[PDB]
Amino acid sequence: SGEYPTVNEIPVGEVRLYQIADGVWSHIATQSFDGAVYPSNGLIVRDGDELLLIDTAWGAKNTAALLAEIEKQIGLPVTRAVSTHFHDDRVGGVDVLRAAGVATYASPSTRRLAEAEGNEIPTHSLEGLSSSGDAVRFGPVELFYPGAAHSTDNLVVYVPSANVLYGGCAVHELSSTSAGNVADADLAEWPTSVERIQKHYPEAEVVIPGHGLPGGLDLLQHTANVVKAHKN
Numbered sequence: 727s728g729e730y731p732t733v734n735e736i737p738v739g740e741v742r743l744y745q746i747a748d749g750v751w752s753h754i755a756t757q758s759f760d761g762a763v764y765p766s767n768g769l770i771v772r773d774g775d776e777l778l779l780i781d782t783a784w785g786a787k788n789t790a791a792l793l794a795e796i797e798k799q800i801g802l803p804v805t806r807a808v809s810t811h812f813h814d815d816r817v818g819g820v821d822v823l824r825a826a827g828v829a830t831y832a833s834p835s836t837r838r839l840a841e842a843e844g845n846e847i848p849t850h851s852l853e854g855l856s857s858s859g860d861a862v863r864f865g866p867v868e869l870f871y872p873g874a875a876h877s878t879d880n881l882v883v884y885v886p887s888a889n890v891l892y893g894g895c896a897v898h899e900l901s902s903t904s905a906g907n908v909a910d911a912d913l914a915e916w917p918t919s920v921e922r923i924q925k926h927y928p929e930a931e932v933v934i935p936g937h938g939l940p941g942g943l944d945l946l947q948h949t950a951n952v953v954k955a956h957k958n
């Protein structure tokens with residue numbers, strides 16, 4: 727009833743949307759992994775009379791449910807999707823998207839990693855993002871490569887019309903107590919990558935993590951704090 731959704735308020739196998747700003751929503755879904763249940767976020771950005779999707783809903787059935795939820799709540803077609811790194815919470819569901827008319831994109835680094843690990847593979851490569859600090863425009867968003875953090879390929883997304891910073895899994899929520907799933911992370915570089923985000927997007931008003939609650943700019947510093955203490 728208007729609070730940011732959590733695993734306790736999303737019915738089994740469903741997806742919820744949350745209005746972030748004019749023409750900006752997050753999507754929230756839950757998934758099981760290694761015997762525990764986790765939420766995850768993605769983004770939806772209005773692109774004229776179409777929608778840009780950032781990240782899948784962590785699995786094929788969740789991503790089908792996402793599309794249905796968008797049709798119900800928004801009613802504009804999703805025409806393009808970007809996955810912000812190679813893990814299943816970002817790309818699992820790309821095959822569903824691709825069979826629903828959505829053109830799927832990711833960096834060449836994400837595509838290589840997804841292929842190597844047996845995850846679903848976005849169709850199109852996003853050039854111009856291979857060097858730390860790189861940024862490109864993609865419809866109504868800017869895509870930014872901050873450097874290695876949660877993964878070596880992680881991208882962040884900025885919505886300049888609304889000053890919304892979608893950090894993806896490079897950014898953690900304020901309640902976090904450790905740096906999440908660090909299997910593919912660079913803990914030593916991650917603070918430097920977060921500093922790059924803070925320097926590039928100082929006017930961000932909303933910051934959305936890859937998992938958990940949105941907040942303000944403090945999510946960035948909090949992230950650096952939890953990563954440095956996880957590494958220690």
Ligand SMILES: C[C@@H](c1cccc2c(-c3ccc(CS(C)(=O)=O)c(F)c3)c(C(=O)O)[nH]c12)N1C[C@H](CN2CC(N)C2)OC1=O
Pocket residue numbers: 759764813814815843876895898899901902903904905906907908909910936937
């Ligand atoms: C599919 C993905 C994955 C699965 C399950 C949980 C998470 C988590 C995760 C997020 C938050 C918390 C709570 S908190 C910050 O701790 O308070 C938390 F507890 C965990 C994150 C993240 O942090 O983004 N992601 C996860 N995967 C899979 C993976 C395995 N790799 C692939 C091989 N190369 C080995 O690595 C990863 O990220």
Ligand SMILES: [Zn+2]
Pocket residue numbers: 811813815876877895
């Ligand atoms: Zn990940």
Ligand SMILES: [Zn+2]
Pocket residue numbers: 813815895936937
């Ligand atoms: Zn994640």
